[PDB]
Amino acid sequence: VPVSVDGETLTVEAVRRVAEERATVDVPAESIAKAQKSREIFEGIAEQNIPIYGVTTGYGAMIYMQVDKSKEVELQTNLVRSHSAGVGPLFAEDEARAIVAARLNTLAKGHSAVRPIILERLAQYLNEGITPAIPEIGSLGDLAPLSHVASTLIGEGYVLRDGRPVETAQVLAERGIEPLELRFKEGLALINGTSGMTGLGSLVVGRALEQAQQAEIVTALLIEAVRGSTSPFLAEGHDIARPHEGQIDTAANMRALMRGSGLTVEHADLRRELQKDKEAGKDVQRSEIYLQKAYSLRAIPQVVGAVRDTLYHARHKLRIELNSANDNPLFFEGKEIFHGANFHGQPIAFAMDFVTIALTQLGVLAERQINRVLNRHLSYGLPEFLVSGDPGLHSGFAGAQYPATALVAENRTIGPASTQSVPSNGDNQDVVSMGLISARNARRVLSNNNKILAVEYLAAAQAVDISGRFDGLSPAAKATYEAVRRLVPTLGVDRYMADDIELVADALSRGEFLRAIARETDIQLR
Amino acid sequence: VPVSVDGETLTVEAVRRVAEERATVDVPAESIAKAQKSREIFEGIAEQNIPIYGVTTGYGAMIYMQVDKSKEVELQTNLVRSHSAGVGPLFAEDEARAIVAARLNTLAKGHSAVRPIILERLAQYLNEGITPAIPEIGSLGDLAPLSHVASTLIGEGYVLRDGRPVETAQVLAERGIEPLELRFKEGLALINGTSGMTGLGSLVVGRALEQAQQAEIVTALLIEAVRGSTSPFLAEGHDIARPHEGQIDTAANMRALMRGSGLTVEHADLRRELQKDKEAGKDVQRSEIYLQKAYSLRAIPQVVGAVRDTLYHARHKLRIELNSANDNPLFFEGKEIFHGANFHGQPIAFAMDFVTIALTQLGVLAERQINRVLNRHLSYGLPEFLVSGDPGLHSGFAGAQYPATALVAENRTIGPASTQSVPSNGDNQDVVSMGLISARNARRVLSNNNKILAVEYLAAAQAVDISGRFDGLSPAAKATYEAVRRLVPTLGVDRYMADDIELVADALSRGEFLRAIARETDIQLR
């Protein structure tokens, strides 16, 4: 029942459990062995005063400075402190945990030549609930953020408790723990990695996929509410015509979500109803029936499908990175110490940047879907703005759309950060990834999307009441509707909406709608 | 040697060699008979005069309008004409050909229900040097762009002639061909797809892969000419510590490039040299030896690899799109007319936007490399800006580095377009992909990168004969160095640089350096 951080199997979903659910983390005895053993071979090497970066030489540009092994502890200590210069807000408990969890798993791969105590210590914090106070800003892609974490391993820096930072020492005494003392290369192996962006990015992509599911969930409800066609979700057009993985998944998810609905119609019905409306004598015939529907309710598989692909690619990279020795230098039995740049988070930087873009478009789609039901000219017969009473006198959902519309614009002002490298440290770092910035951007767009989806969920439910097509809703649709109605009542007369939207946005955040679907239906969502 | 457009096996490279090398295109009778199978049943359905988007109805928001069969011809004609609102510059011959192919390969799938003569007419044009005049702007992701290619088939619009356009009516009769007639679904099937972004992206991604190869090529020459370390490219540092596909591919390419070099140095020896330079004691010493070279010379596998992974994914989505039925509606046997949205180039929109970002970081790395070699402090001994004679009097490459630095900034000004959807057509197209814009974006950064590498190649060659390290160069470096001089002589004294730069860039775009290796060397670069 405990998460296994062996540095080879760790998954994104598992990182969330540890970060969010608090799942316990255990370092297999086999890993500790590879560590303890490797810690002995490496120690013997450094014990000869041999040139080894971050162990017997300066840091970064100062690699030209040779340090005698006599200052083994000071070298690693001065590093953690001098580099503990993070600024800005502190990371959320869950975020901070994902970060540490990613680092623990990094050194656990048995290539950082660290003592087991370090692995045990990190694990202790994750289990005993000792969350380090990690400043969001500082890493160039993740020295600063990781330096603040490492600081807590020696009884320094700050620990996060109730959103506020508290001296690590005072907290250790309260827990009875005795601060550790960094050893040969111990301080460098703790901060030198992509754990910051990998842990944060892990949570995002994980939740991103949940957001994708919840997007399809509400989209299905809306489709049934407006009585759209199902043809656009037939397997033939995807599994065959367009074999895009993500596209096929979305289409399949929609097909199941709308299973058993008396609202949705099939092409064979639209053409049947159309060929009958043309009852007119001949020629150019103007009909009130639409053989199809706007892209917002037709190209769902393609758009959300492309979003899924990006997410898959991200999870893949995130998976590989999680189980990789992002560190330097690296030790390898019967080999010279590896001196490269595995701390560089370009792969994750590019990934998160892509999630930001992908997520932005997911929000674009939802926003336009909201605009659809609110537009009397595009609502397919629904009252303008879903007003149940007297229009004009009541605005209905008119004011509820702006926050969603305003969000699409905001999300569009977030540009990729993985290409914004700036040379620092005597040019020694002439090319960086800025991965942590990319991960945070993705998190913002993700967060914003919840608020947009909140307006879409409320609108849908409202649409259901207005049209009075609840008894026509499918099994999954009914669950979605009720899941929303349980949080927010139908909009009869105009009223304060701010709280209503924040309420559903929170629910969507906790994957509350994806839940109601699993426990209320036999539906299995991809 | 001909390439077959069957709609299932067509590859990116095939598209390149077809649009570039003027390769011949073959449509296996299998696909022909499939289009027949389709073209046979469908036409029958249209005979029943039953509703069918584009075939017996309006387009977009005009879907409510129903067109009686008696106008099968006109309808398909008005659409192609009125939608021929392409503006901006005209695509190049290869670009266009690359698009016309993508459209043929799509119709070859056999779900577009178009007459086989359509695939025969398209497959011909490509084989008979008849390229249409495609305006670059107008597609929302690609009616307009494809509306022009469809115009030439009906003997209308303009065809590409020596850079300029010319009435298709003149060229046709000037070849022995007579305009065609568009039957039901013929005009909509020709313009209702993502051939623009897919065809354009294909070339870009294909050329991008070579850039990565050529980026690695010169990078190796520089590392050698600067006497860098090999540790960074060791196999263990990747296949074991960080098994990122691209990262592994890059780390393997660098080893084969600097394979057997006299200028390169092994860590063991670096470690042994430094050690000897250290005086006994328990203090800190200052050395001139660098155990580790700067990021621009040690983080290639990570950065360039991240790019590779992005190009890999992009090539993947393209290969799927290339062989997908990106049309609408779709015709299958035993099934109803699938009315979906596979014309939505979202899958490629994201793909290309991702390429733009990746290739941008690639330029950042290359540029910082040019800076690393031109800065006497980061040159590692090389003279100021590689000045052959007396400095101050001669600037050397000082003025050359400016265009490269400037290009890095210009590239950063290109933002993602796949998220810039703008509603139109009575809200019928509430969500688009702007995929064609995304593809151009990558095409620009790709072209810009050629100039960046051009300055890097020249600078690198200069560094070589500036320190007299040619004899130390390895088999591959020599080949690379040789390729440079064959076009541009070594810089003896200040002189016009524009030509030399544009010359090396024009060569890079052709892949002169990538080939020089496969031949003069035998190296099979990934």
Side-chain angles (χ1 to χ4, degrees), chain A residues 212-466:
Chain A
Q213 290 165 324
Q214 269 161 348
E216 305 159 333
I217 289 171
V218 74
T219 290
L221 165 63
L222 176 54
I223 285 176
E224 294 188 44
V226 308
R227 290 199 77 190
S229 154
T230 61
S231 182
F233 309 94
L234 315 172
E236 320 99 55
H238 317 59
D239 295 29
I240 312 179
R242 232 171 177 223
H244 274 290
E245 172 158 26
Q247 188 168 326
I248 293 165
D249 304 12
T250 284
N253 268 20
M254 294 295 301
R255 282 201 302 268
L257 277 164
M258 320 205 268
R259 180 256 296 142
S261 204
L263 293 185
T264 61
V265 303
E266 185 150 294
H267 179 267
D269 295 289
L270 270 175
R271 69 176 183 85
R272 267 172 200 150
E273 138 181 1
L274 252 173
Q275 165 133 311
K276 300 174 166 254
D277 192 83
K278 287 158 90 191
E279 100 265 319
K282 225 148 307 207
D283 317 305
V284 218
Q285 338 194 39
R286 302 172 92 292
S287 196
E288 297 216 43
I289 95 182
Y290 285 81
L291 210 44
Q292 260 168 180
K293 316 294 175 121
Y295 295 13
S296 4
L297 306 176
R298 183 138 55 83
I300 289 136
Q302 292 84 23
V303 174
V304 176
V307 172
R308 256 152 185 304
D309 275 329
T310 308
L311 295 190
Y312 297 158
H313 189 239
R315 188 175 52 192
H316 181 202
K317 297 276 101 199
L318 284 172
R319 180 171 71 53
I320 288 163
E321 193 68 359
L322 279 164
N323 306 294
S324 79
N326 36 260
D327 179 29
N328 203 61
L330 299 178
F331 172 56
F332 289 110
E333 195 157 54
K335 269 168 162 65
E336 288 275 346
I337 297 173
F338 180 72
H339 277 63
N342 278 314
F343 41 63
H344 215 286
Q346 198 67 60
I348 298 312
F350 275 7
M352 293 331 291
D353 261 18
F354 299 165
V355 176
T356 291
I357 291 165
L359 280 183
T360 304
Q361 188 64 356
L362 184 65
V364 159
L365 179 58
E367 135 83 0
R368 291 292 81 192
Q369 285 160 340
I370 285 166
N371 180 81
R372 195 112 201 133
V373 267
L374 301 190
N375 201 311
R376 63 164 183 173
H377 293 136
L378 325 159
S379 85
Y380 307 124
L382 298 166
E384 54 275 61
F385 305 103
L386 304 183
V387 167
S388 38
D390 287 288
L393 189 85
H394 285 98
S395 298
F397 271 68
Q401 170 183 14
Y402 307 141
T405 311
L407 276 163
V408 166
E410 180 151 343
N411 280 338
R412 269 164 179 180
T413 65
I414 299 134
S418 80
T419 66
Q420 298 297 337
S421 172
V422 181
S424 61
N425 190 57
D427 289 302
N428 175 65
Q429 297 178 57
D430 20 38
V431 204
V432 294
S433 78
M434 235 61 98
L436 200 31
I437 298 173
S438 307
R440 284 203 287 115
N441 284 346
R443 174 195 64 184
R444 172 184 197 189
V445 176
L446 165 76
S447 179
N448 292 341
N449 278 343
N450 287 322
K451 320 258 227 278
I452 298 183
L453 293 180
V455 175
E456 172 160 26
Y457 271 86
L458 288 163
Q462 178 73 347
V464 169
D465 294 331
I466 300 244

Side-chain angles (χ1 to χ4, degrees), chain B residues 176-464:
Chain B
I177 316 156
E178 251 64 87
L180 267 187
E181 151 196 331
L182 287 173
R183 301 299 301 308
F184 292 118
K185 207 204 175 288
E186 298 233 294
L188 172 64
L190 271 169
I191 83 193
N192 204 23
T194 71
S195 281
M197 60 177 90
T198 278
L200 187 67
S202 296
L203 300 185
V204 175
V205 161
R207 274 148 193 191
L209 285 172
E210 288 185 21
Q211 198 154 73
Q213 285 171 317
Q214 295 193 299
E216 307 169 319
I217 278 180
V218 57
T219 300
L221 164 69
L222 222 185
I223 283 138
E224 274 196 85
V226 106
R227 311 268 321 218
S229 178
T230 16
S231 196
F233 324 92
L234 295 186
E236 59 265 33
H238 308 83
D239 308 49
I240 309 193
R242 214 187 181 167
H244 267 111
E245 175 149 59
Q247 191 170 325
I248 288 169
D249 286 349
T250 284
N253 281 20
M254 300 299 299
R255 267 165 344 210
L257 284 165
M258 331 170 223
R259 194 181 290 308
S261 165
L263 291 174
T264 275
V265 298
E266 303 292 287
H267 188 82
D269 294 302
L270 248 176
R271 171 194 56 166
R272 277 189 280 261
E273 148 154 77
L274 185 48
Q275 179 47 64
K276 173 77 181 204
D277 203 46
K278 300 211 280 155
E279 288 188 19
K282 341 113 36 131
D283 39 36
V284 35
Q285 252 170 347
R286 303 179 69 97
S287 184
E288 228 120 43
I289 301 149
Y290 287 70
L291 212 77
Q292 257 171 347
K293 315 302 169 181
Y295 288 12
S296 60
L297 302 176
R298 154 167 49 114
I300 288 68
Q302 289 85 14
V303 161
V304 177
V307 185
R308 277 196 177 270
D309 283 333
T310 309
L311 301 176
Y312 290 165
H313 185 265
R315 163 177 71 182
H316 183 203
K317 297 282 99 197
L318 276 165
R319 178 167 52 65
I320 297 191
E321 195 72 16
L322 273 166
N323 304 312
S324 69
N326 51 101
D327 187 43
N328 190 76
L330 300 195
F331 176 100
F332 313 80
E333 42 170 44
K335 301 236 183 208
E336 293 272 308
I337 312 288
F338 170 82
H339 286 55
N342 284 126
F343 42 57
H344 210 285
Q346 197 65 62
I348 312 305
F350 282 154
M352 291 322 282
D353 265 5
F354 299 154
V355 170
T356 293
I357 294 161
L359 278 171
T360 281
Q361 177 58 353
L362 184 83
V364 176
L365 178 40
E367 129 88 5
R368 289 293 91 196
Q369 265 150 21
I370 297 180
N371 182 82
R372 183 111 223 142
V373 76
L374 287 185
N375 204 328
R376 75 163 144 163
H377 299 129
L378 316 164
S379 198
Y380 290 131
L382 307 184
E384 305 100 292
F385 307 87
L386 315 166
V387 166
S388 198
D390 299 80
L393 192 43
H394 285 124
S395 311
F397 270 76
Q401 182 204 350
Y402 294 138
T405 315
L407 279 167
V408 165
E410 168 152 354
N411 272 338
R412 275 156 176 193
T413 52
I414 308 161
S418 68
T419 57
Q420 304 283 9
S421 164
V422 187
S424 89
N425 185 63
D427 294 303
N428 200 278
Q429 306 196 222
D430 26 13
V431 173
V432 291
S433 72
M434 309 297 191
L436 203 30
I437 298 179
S438 303
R440 296 208 268 112
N441 281 340
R443 184 198 61 185
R444 169 180 188 189
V445 177
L446 174 68
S447 163
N448 294 339
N449 290 348
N450 281 331
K451 299 139 147 75
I452 291 179
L453 295 164
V455 188
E456 217 203 323
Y457 270 84
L458 290 181
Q462 178 70 46
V464 170

Side-chain angles (χ1 to χ4, degrees), chain A residues 488-508:
Chain A
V488 184
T490 183
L491 190 67
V493 300
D494 275 7
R495 101 213 171 194
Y496 199 75
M497 316 272 283
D499 301 321
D500 285 13
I501 314 170
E502 284 311 50
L503 209 74
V504 163
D506 278 17
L508 279 141

